[PDB]
Amino acid sequence: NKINIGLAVMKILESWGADTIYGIPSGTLSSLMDAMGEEENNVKFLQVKHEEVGAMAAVMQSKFGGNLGVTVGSGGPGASHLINGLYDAAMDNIPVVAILGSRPQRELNMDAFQELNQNPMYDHIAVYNRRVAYAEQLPKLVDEAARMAIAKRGVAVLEVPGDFAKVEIDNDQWYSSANSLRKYAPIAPAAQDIDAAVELLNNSKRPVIYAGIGTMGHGPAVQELARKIKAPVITTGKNFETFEWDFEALTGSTYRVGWKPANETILEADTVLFAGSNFPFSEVEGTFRNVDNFIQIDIDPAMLGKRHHADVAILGDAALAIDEILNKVDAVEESAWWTANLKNIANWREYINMLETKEEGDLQFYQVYNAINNHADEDAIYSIDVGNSTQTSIRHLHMTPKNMWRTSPLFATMGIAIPGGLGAKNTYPDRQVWNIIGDGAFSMTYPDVVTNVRYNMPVINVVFSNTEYAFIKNKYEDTNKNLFGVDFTDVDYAKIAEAQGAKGFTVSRIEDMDRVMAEAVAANKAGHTVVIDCKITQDRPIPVETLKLDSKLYSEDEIKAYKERYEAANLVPFREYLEAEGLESKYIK
Amino acid sequence: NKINIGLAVMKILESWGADTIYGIPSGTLSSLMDAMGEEENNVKFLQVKHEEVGAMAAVMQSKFGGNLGVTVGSGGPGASHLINGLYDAAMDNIPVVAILGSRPQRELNMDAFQELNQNPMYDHIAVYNRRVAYAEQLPKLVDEAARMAIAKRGVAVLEVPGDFAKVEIDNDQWYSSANSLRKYAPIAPAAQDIDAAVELLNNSKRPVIYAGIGTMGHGPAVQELARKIKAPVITTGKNFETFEWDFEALTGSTYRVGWKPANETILEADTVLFAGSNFPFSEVEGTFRNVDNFIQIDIDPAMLGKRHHADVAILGDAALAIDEILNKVDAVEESAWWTANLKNIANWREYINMLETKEEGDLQFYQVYNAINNHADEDAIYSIDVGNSTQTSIRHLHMTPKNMWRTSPLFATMGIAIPGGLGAKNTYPDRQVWNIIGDGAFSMTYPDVVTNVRYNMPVINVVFSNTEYAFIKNKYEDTNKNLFGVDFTDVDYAKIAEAQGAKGFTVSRIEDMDRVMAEAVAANKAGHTVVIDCKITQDRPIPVETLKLDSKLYSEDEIKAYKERYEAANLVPFREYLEAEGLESKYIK
Amino acid sequence: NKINIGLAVMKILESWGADTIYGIPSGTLSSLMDAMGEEENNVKFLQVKHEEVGAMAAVMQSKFGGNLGVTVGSGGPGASHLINGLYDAAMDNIPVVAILGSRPQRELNMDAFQELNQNPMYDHIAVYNRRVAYAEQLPKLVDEAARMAIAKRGVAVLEVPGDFAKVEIDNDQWYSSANSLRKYAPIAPAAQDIDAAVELLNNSKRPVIYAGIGTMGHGPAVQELARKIKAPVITTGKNFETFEWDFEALTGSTYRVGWKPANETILEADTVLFAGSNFPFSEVEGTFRNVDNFIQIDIDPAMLGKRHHADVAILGDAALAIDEILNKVDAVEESAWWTANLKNIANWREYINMLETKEEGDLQFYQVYNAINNHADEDAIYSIDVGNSTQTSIRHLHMTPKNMWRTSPLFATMGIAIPGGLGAKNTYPDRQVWNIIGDGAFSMTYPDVVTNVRYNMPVINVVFSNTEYAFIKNKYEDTNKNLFGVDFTDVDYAKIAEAQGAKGFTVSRIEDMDRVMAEAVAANKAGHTVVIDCKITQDRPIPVETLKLDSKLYSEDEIKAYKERYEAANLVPFREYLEAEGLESKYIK
Ligand SMILES: Cc1cc2nc3c(=O)[nH]c(=O)nc-3n(C[C@H](O)[C@H](O)[C@H](O)COP(=O)(O)OP(=O)(O)OC[C@H]3O[C@@H](n4cnc5c(N)ncnc54)[C@H](O)[C@@H]3O)c2cc1C
Ligand SMILES: Cc1cc2nc3c(=O)[nH]c(=O)nc-3n(C[C@H](O)[C@H](O)[C@H](O)COP(=O)(O)OP(=O)(O)OC[C@H]3O[C@@H](n4cnc5c(N)ncnc54)[C@H](O)[C@@H]3O)c2cc1C
Ligand SMILES: Cc1cc2nc3c(=O)[nH]c(=O)nc-3n(C[C@H](O)[C@H](O)[C@H](O)COP(=O)(O)OP(=O)(O)OC[C@H]3O[C@@H](n4cnc5c(N)ncnc54)[C@H](O)[C@@H]3O)c2cc1C
Ligand SMILES: CC(=O)c1sc(CCOP(=O)(O)OP(=O)(O)O)c(C)[n+]1Cc1cnc(C)nc1N
Ligand SMILES: CC(=O)c1sc(CCOP(=O)(O)OP(=O)(O)O)c(C)[n+]1Cc1cnc(C)nc1N
Ligand SMILES: CC(=O)c1sc(CCOP(=O)(O)OP(=O)(O)O)c(C)[n+]1Cc1cnc(C)nc1N
Ligand SMILES: [Mg+2]
Ligand SMILES: [Mg+2]
Ligand SMILES: [Mg+2]
Structure with a gap:
């Protein structure tokens, strides 16, 4: 007639689809974990080597379309190690439940061993942050933590005294509200607002569509609109997969992690259709300084008119808005504007292709991506780390909506790649997963390569070894009238991978890249985690x-x-x- | 007539003795670093592979008696990575300056790239936490940051917009207050309080001296008092170096990271001389439940009567107090109490010695320490990580005041060892430094082994590979009516070290340990960083x-x-x- | 071609409808206020006597259906005085902009006079909390502050260095996003969920409708549904105005601030239609312990299944949901359940009416309300303070949807009444406004009675003088096995009102109450603020x-x-x- 509180917690997590908990065991978490696996419960534990990797994996799991992730950190140091992953989730508005283990209740406030008030730790970024006051309410709080993380699209944090999960309760003293989970269906936009947009687009001589991730799932519609009114397309650094990599009118993204076309188009455009975006460089880089009219589409009221004065504001789903616009707008037969943009894009693609298709020489970023393009599955998942890898991947990868590309785009924490691969492979075990990493970021996380090995979650790590924190040093040449402290010694990552039970490869020449990639992929298909140590030049992109x-x-x-x-x-x-x-x-x- | 604000900052840091800055380069820190090395300035930059290692090294630097450390973290993810090191410093009350890089001032509040309010991040644990409001006051704030970290014995945090250090000012618009640095000399205790202590000790039938780090530097005096009144000695887990490892009356420390003698003595004692300690297990483990009288010595008023009712309270330096007590107390010729304790200690040493001196078999913790004892320099420094290594090191290392032993004792974050070695070697370049690490903690920090290699700061890493998070699993057998998720696969750490430019060794048999240690030390003396992968049994200490x-x-x-x-x-x-x-x-x- | 930043801020506030700023002048706010009234701007300043009253008035302004309120607090003490008003807004999810004045930028971090970091002050409860980094972005931040307060339904806080508003900028360097303000129209519920509700209601033998403020504006529909299926109605303490005070099937509210009928009905009910409520006593008082089925309607996903397991969950507007249910549900001709409830309600009304209509004796709460009922306008607004006034007002006032009743329901801060009257009268200058206050709360705010006088915003203050903090003392008889410290001396509030330029009345007998109220109302219609000092008995409700x-x-x-x-x-x-x-x-x- 009774049930262990720990088992109740697992049942609740299971009901919310949160079937995977990432972390490292601890005395302050013993009770909770001890309950995992009971009464046919299917909540599994994925042990990482550093809690930050566990927190990031739990978050990336949702980013890649997986279930609600749960991350655990032992009281004190384990919990604090979750920070980079939680801040990333907070800034990206991604749901994630974080459980902070704690000393038993009797030890609280006694200034005992590893005993401290962890409530301040994440109060600033959390949408829910509470210290369980007694064992009996732990189930209710975990249930609410899940509900709130999902409803508020953010980090739900619970501090749990280690002795609570051992307590027993009546089975009728707990319940899950997962059955009541409800979400709003896409909301149609106000016709009045769509019409104002249409009028502006019809009268514009140089229209341009700036599409953010709000357009995810509607790339074909965006491409159709682009062709109908002859408006080139600019995308954000997070939204490349939404378009066919070779779309004739895709100019890429603006600013640093972007393409030449996009950066030029935006400064020459008249009317911008800012669709589903919250582009952060807008004001500080003066992205829209020469634009005459600005039309914005967004489901979040707080974003309307945020990045620039909006002449027309459309509250509602981007898909529906794009469809309404497409159907009401006038078709454009020819445009000097469109023609010039297409040629400028074509010029850029000639440049990019020739870099990617070189046949011999010292290896550069370009040929590694060329090889990835020639050997990757059409539905491959790419977990991108922070640095030159971000800048280059969106220029050289040939993605389509069948792919998924994710990184740490706003908080931009390095080391997001390996965790990304874990969350991805956990969600899609039979899907090809790639981790594109710079050596600096790899250095902050390679001990976790063993995690993929240990849990038989085969991934392909592509490491760009330029022996520098390039993204910074490169910019140092401009902003800095010097440089200093941006280089390090090269280490044999392939050998490190072997020591971890993974398969390592080393490549430094363009003429060997295709064969190395072939062998790396074949190994991945043999169930092995791979590390391709790409000894590249220091050529700045x-x-x-x-x-x-x-x-x-x-x-x-x-x-x-x-x-x-x-x-x-x-x-x-x-x-x-x-x-x-x-x-x-x-x-x- | 003018000076770069960045150079002014370096001059101020130099004046406070803070000649080393640990971290990783960043765009948000470019200006500050760009100024390093100018006008004969000697502030050096030590590049780590993970900012948490930099923060921990800066802190451990002071723990080991070095200069005020400075750690830098790039705006957002770099700064958040400092957390485990800052929390350790906060709980240990260690001075350290943390500089958080930030977007340029114009970008603040614009919701720009990697732009956020970092003031909440460390407000709870810092003794100083401010966001520089304009370039001109940066020098003044760095100067105060140093002064406050030292005076308040804690973490001083400054958030610095990246564009400030480039600004120029008149040389007369800045100054350092380092020249005014003053500290209080040891304060003598009130005679009235010493006399009350003496009376109690004279009349006690079972006295015991419980010495904390407040007695650091006065071990001989404590040993002399112990022999004079025939009172056995109990030490805290942080204070072993204060005593000769083989002192006849040393019972060790109580609770888990302790010895058998100490744990038994405390439950049989009448009067306790709690000298310079803030032992955290006191209340929750009922350490003093059978004690009749309690005498406390401490320089901090906030600690007097904190861990137990104090019958006598002595405010002042432990050295002076011990000296006054020693001189006024009655000499004790013989004591059944003393005799029984000495024999109990002797019994324990027989046990420990026989474990350490086995000649053949599967390697255990014991023989690794035996080897360290037979080959280490007499003034060796030991940087201890968190786990079974902590528990075993204080039982099996044969230290004296000539040594230094430090860890992360209260916050207890794993991964403190490697950073500890960096801070130690930076402070004492010609001194032998050992990092005693469990494989779990090593896994959270081994990428930084290359840092010792790159900066030619030779250290000896001793890694205990038991393929488990033992300190927890061991306790799991007791507290947990199960176990689960505490084991992992073994990796070739020696091979990883080689890939990093370090020298690796692997040992799994007792009969090979002495030779392996000999070769490891010889290599360290050849200027190489060493990693000894000790494949030990899973025998629980x-x-x-x-x-x-x-x-x-x-x-x-x-x-x-x-x-x-x-x-x-x-x-x-x-x-x-x-x-x-x-x-x-x-x-x- | 240029404009004063202060005037730009006022223009932005005006565009968002925020035409009233409450507060007290200050050196740290001089620049902002100095700009009020320029270039035909219509943003007025309402000076209060205590900043907490200003903060509460700004919040209550929205509660009463007015424009977005703005409250100012001078750096340090002025800003901290805003706390009770901001916490109330936060817990009630009411939009409000709070501007914290601050020392000029040059003084920040200098430990100058009244200079401190105010960012921590309200970070925990705010939906937006930033310190303006430079003058030029002040306009943008005020605009976003308004947008966020509205979109996030909460407190937006800005700390503003006093020297910024004096700075001048180009008129094209600022803009308001008020023109892009968009809100979602009521969302229809999923038919599948409405049908499940209907089925349960049809099959229920003892249905009951528990209506929260989510049903505001749809009382007639709720009363119609109640009669159609013969389901009695329970309301929350915040939702009485939604029903005709004499509705035959209104049982009142449960728990302490409730009626007898409601408290009995809920423990005998089978199926509950929890419509638009987040009743806080649900779990801790076991409100639904005997209920068999639970159906919930709410527009907020985070609330679905929160207060009790939900057998049916309906996401969407309460109006639409009630309409769909009303139309699909089966009509019930007669019900023993309904009949018993009606008689129980009738019994309660006999009790209440006889108390209210006594003719002679010592004055009690009851007869004061009786008088208010016989003299108040049909669309009167009631600003209720915290204590016995809350408990009694919902039992003895005879309201209808034409009225408005508001208090501080969740945070429950005393002193909310007078501020409530200010916000109400500011919004509806020709509408009759009543402040129902206990003497304890009046004592925390009566100096602000002069504010109504000074600004010619006539209100009627009804003060219940029982010379005790009754709501507590009353409960003390139960929870406390003693009492102590809950009484005070009586003061002549009528005389205090006269000293403030207001009209005071004193009444202590039932036979004088009708005449006193008549004279008080006549005075209010003469444009005077009135204070009726009701010397009542200590009879516990x-x-x-x-x-x-x-x-x-x-x-x-x-x-x-x-x-x-x-x-x-x-x-x-x-x-x-x-x-x-x-x-x-x-x-x-
Ligand atoms: C090292 C590094 C460098 C970078 N450099 C660049 C760079 O140079 N250029 C660049 O562009 N990016 C760059 N990025 C990424 C950049 O920082 C931003 O994260 C990214 O551009 C934001 O893209 P977004 O606007 O698509 O989406 P978000 O910022 O996530 O905003 C999406 C918007 O869509 C709305 N939305 C969601 N669903 C819907 C819907 N159904 N209908 C309508 N609206 C909806 C949301 O409310 C929101 O406002 C970089 C990242 C890193 C890590
Ligand atoms: C995994 C792990 C396990 C551990 N297990 C144990 C265990 O089982 N047992 C154990 O004992 N420890 C254990 N520790 C260490 C333990 O947690 C405490 O940190 C340690 O015991 C505190 O020692 P202390 O009292 O010497 O010093 P502190 O806690 O640092 O307190 C020192 C005191 O000395 C005072 N003081 C300073 N200078 C002077 C002066 N000149 N004169 C007088 N007073 C002065 C200070 O004001 C302070 O009150 C463990 C640590 C870890 C990481
Ligand atoms: C001294 C004091 C004593 C009190 N005593 C009592 C007491 O004894 N009993 C009592 O009941 N109260 C009492 N109260 C008030 C009580 O504390 C609560 O504030 C109140 O009951 C909450 O009422 P509610 O559920 O209507 O609204 P809220 O708590 O405001 O919740 C309203 C709900 O409606 C939803 N909603 C909003 N709009 C819509 C829509 N269009 N369609 C659907 N859903 C919508 C919201 O998402 C929310 O979940 C007291 C207050 C004070 C100050
Ligand atoms: C964007 C940002 O803040 C970058 S980009 C970058 C260079 C990364 O070097 P890596 O070697 O991984 O890649 P490469 O550029 O290809 O050489 C650094 C150090 N940073 C700062 C930084 C510091 N530390 C952390 C944890 N995260 C970030 N983002
Ligand atoms: C004390 C504490 O909180 C310990 S001791 C311990 C075992 C360490 O395993 P390792 O393999 O390094 O050593 P071993 O015991 O010799 O096997 C863990 C996981 N923890 C929890 C923990 C988790 N995570 C971090 C960052 N710090 C700590 N202290
Ligand atoms: C609900 C709650 O927390 C109440 S109700 C109450 C009695 C109010 O006395 P008053 O004389 O105004 O009214 P009366 O009951 O009619 O006599 C007190 C002190 N409190 C505690 C309290 C204390 N202080 C403040 C600022 N707010 C509250 N709510
Ligand atoms: Mg690199
Ligand atoms: Mg281990
Ligand atoms: Mg009263």
């Missing part, structure tokens, strides 16, 4: 946030040096393509 | 917090099993030694 | 949370004493009415 190509903006000397350093001799400034179509730059005089 | 040896407390079956499992056939319960001297247990009936 | 009337639950002695003390000789326990209709209590045996 082309900095499209500072395009030194237009002779009316930079000196010939500057242009020559820029072309030379970035192998961009054939890149043509957008103004040339505009003028060829009889148009004039609206800001370059 | 004897649990002295639950001594099942007295037939009046446990069944014969229990005693037999306990002796069998812990190879303690020859250990004799303290009550036998007491009775042999004509005394009776005061609680065992 | 009947405690319906402990009904000692059923002989099968209490001894005859207890019942006699209960009837005697609360003049309830004629109250009949519900079980009698149930049995008379051939039904049996489901829990009283």
